[PDB]
């Protein structure tokens, strides 16, 4: 039923992206893809790329009925942050975060 795909350690915060992903939680691909091509952040095209491969999986492998596919679930969690600096004449620091993204997509059934 469920296909799945996952983005590994992506250079965005979950605080950055939880919002964009808190919309499609319980929807269809069609509306969802449209929304991704519609609204304007940098999360969008990536998430879209993800789903296109997710359904490449679901169809090439499991061969299910696309339009009847709804969002099963999808979210993300933290990842391996890195660290950088600010010159300033004396020391100063910062941290660059990442993200672990998951989408599971079902034909809404078993």
């Amino acid at each position: 039923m469920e296909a799945k795909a996952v983005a590994r350690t992506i250079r965005i915060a979950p605080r950055k992206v939880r919002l964009v992903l808190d919309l499609i939680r319980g929807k269809n691909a069609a509306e969802a893809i449209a929304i991704l091509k519609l609204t304007n952040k940098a999360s969008s095209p990536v998430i879209e790329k993800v789903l296109m491969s997710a359904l490449a999986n679901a169809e090439h492998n499991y061969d299910m009925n696309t339009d009847e596919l709804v969002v099963k679930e999808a979210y993300a969690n933290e990842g391996p942050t890195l660290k950088r600096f600010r010159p300033q004449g004396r020391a100063s620091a910062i941290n660059k975060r990442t993200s672990h993204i998951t989408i599971v997509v079902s034909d809404g059934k078993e």
């Binding site: 919002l19 964009v20 808190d22 919309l23 509306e31 449209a34 929304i35 091509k37 519609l38 609204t39």
Partner: protein, 48 residues
């Protein structure tokens, strides 16, 4: 002019309630085109 106490996560998420984002209208194009939004020229098969 800096924090006295710590931010309870309660209070955090409680403030972040209206920290959201809404969507576009997203109708069909019956004047001309595919599913394309209310009176909308072609971004993908649109009319108005």
């Amino acid at each position: 002019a800096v924090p006295k106490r710590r931010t309870s996560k309660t209070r955090k998420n409680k403030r972040r309630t209206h920290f959201k984002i809404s969507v576009p209208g997203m109708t069909e194009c019956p004047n001309c085109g595919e599913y394309k939004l209310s009176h909308r020229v072609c971004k993908n098969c649109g009319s108005y």
